[PDB]
């Protein structure tokens, strides 16, 4: 798949499973750079998020991780998105395992989710579950 919201898709055997049968599970993970700031404090910058994830809800569910200290590290969480980009800056404290914070974020927030294929369509008036082949075929014969 090529999501309009970008990101990273993990799970080729399952993309295959889903193109074979119509059903599969795949992981979808946000794009991130790490940003070394003045002084010496690192800062995670998220720049693509998973398909159909509410950005506000997300930013909020991260500040919700901060103020509940569900993990330590997060000094500030701040949506810097604008006209020419999508930028969420998660700024960390001095001395805070950045790898730890990132992984806990992927695990416990929607910074990373699952996409489940379930490809049903109406093919001759009845629903059918289809892989890539009856879809492409069906297309072709239509044309």
């Amino acid at each position: 798949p090529d999501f309009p919201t970008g990101a990273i898709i993990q799970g080729r055997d399952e993309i295959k499973k889903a193109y074979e049968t119509g059903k599969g599970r795949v992981v979808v993970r946000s794009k991130t750079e790490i940003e070394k700031l003045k002084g010496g404090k690192e800062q995670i910058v998220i720049t693509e998020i998973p398909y159909e994830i509410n950005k506000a809800n997300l930013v909020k569910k991260i500040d919700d991780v901060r103020v509940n200290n569900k993990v330590a590290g997060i000094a500030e969480v701040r949506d810097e998105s604008d006209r020419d980009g999508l930028r969420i800056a998660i700024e960390l404290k001095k001395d805070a395992n950045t790898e730890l914070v990132l992984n806990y974020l992927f695990k416990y927030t929607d910074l990373q989710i699952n996409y489940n294929f379930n490809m049903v369509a109406i093919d001759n008036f009845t629903p059918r579950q289809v892989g890539i082949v009856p879809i492409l075929s069906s297309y072709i014969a239509h044309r």
Partner: protein
């Protein structure tokens, strides 16, 4: 000269975090170089060459030099760099002629200190290529070295540090006169300033403290600390003592002038500060390995003392900016607990990122 033990256990000296370790060694040598220049013998040139090696020259200081694993800065074996490099090369030029020697694979010499060419002045250069036998990634990252040189330059004032990169013909050159003042200026040059830069220095019971601080229109505070020019990545007593004096002297000012008692932070919303103190050996204790956290219980009051004094006086400087900070604080408390209250439950406003009454528009 070179040292077998570091090769046998490089992490223990450098921490081959690769190539974060690779950069740890460059810190070592160049800090040693700086140190040796501070010893009276006033500029260090760091050069990332095009062939990938690192030259580091200054203008029996020689083995006084190349023996690092010394995070000083505080203005048959031995030496970890020569020991951790497929090739090192020490050229001294002291008295009308230049002596040189090179060392290969691990520290083994390969030529004698002989003379080659006569130089008309003095100085010493060490150039070296690390090895991808012990190192994964031997790429010297220009921006990292640039950064460390920079902060190294805030800290020690009587020295200047250059850094040129033959790979991509560029070169910075750091020299800071105002010092720790100029540090915190650099911490808040990306941001929007509020108050100007505060600065107090001190000396007591063996401790010499120097603390500069100023406000941006931000949320997270930025407070970096140094015992003896090495950093305290995780702070401790000296820091807590500085923090014990800002909320102490302000609450006190709060009760008098600003009427008004307030939390720990609230007064540190958007406060960046640079803390560098000097502890004597007899008072200097850390934590369970790694100088990352100061433990010295005497440093908590001596910092608290020095800063709280100065800050009490220079709080009678102006009142325009004093009542104002005490106003912003009282604001911060309110905003803070407005989260605590909202949380316990478990408004159409779309609020501006940076709190600053002076500039914000509703």
């Amino acid at each position: 000269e070179g040292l077998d033990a570091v090769r046998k256990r490089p992490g223990m000296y450098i921490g081959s975090t690769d190539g974060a370790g690779l950069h740890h060694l460059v810190w070592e040598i160049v800090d040693n170089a700086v140190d040796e220049a501070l010893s009276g013998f006033d500029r260090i040139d760091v050069t990332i060459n095009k062939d990938g090696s690192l030259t580091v020259q200054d203008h029996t200081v020689e083995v006084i030099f190349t023996i690092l694993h010394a995070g000083g800065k505080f203005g048959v074996g031995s030496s970890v760099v020569n020991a951790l490099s497929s090739w090192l090369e020490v050229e001294i030029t002291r008295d009308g002629a230049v002596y040189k020697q090179r060392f290969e694979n691990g520290g083994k010499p390969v030529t004698t200190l002989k003379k080659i060419g006569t130089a008309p002045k003095t100085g010493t250069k060490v150039t070296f290529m690390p090895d991808a036998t012990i190192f994964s990634t031997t790429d010297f990252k220009y921006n990292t070295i640039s950064e460390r040189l920079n902060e190294s330059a805030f800290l020690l004032k009587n020295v200047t540090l250059s850094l040129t990169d033959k790979r991509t013909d560029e070169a910075i050159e750091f020299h800071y006169e105002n010092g720790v003042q100029d540090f915190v200026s650099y911490l808040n040059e990306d941001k929007e300033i509020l108050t100007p830069v505060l600065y107090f220095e001190g000396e007591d019971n063996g401790f010499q403290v120097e603390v500069a601080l100023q406000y941006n229109d931000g949320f997270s505070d930025n407070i970096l600390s140094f015992v003896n020019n090495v950093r305290t990545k995780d702070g401790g007593t000296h820091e807590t003592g500085l923090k014990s004096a800002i909320t102490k002297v302000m609450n006190d000012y709060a009760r008098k002038t600003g009427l008004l008692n307030l939390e720990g932070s609230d007064y540190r919303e958007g406060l960046a500060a640079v803390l560098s103190i000097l502890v004597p050996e007899e008072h200097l204790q850390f934590e369970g390995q790694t100088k990352d956290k100061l433990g010295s219980p005497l440093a908590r009051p001596v910092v608290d003392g020095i800063v709280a004094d100065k800050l009490t006086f220079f709080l009678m400087e102006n009142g325009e900016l004093a009542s104002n900070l005490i106003r912003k604080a009282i604001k911060a408390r309110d905003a803070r607990e407005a989260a605590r209250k909202a949380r316990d439950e478990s408004g159409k406003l779309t609020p501006a990122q940076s709190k600053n009454p002076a500039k914000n528009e509703l």
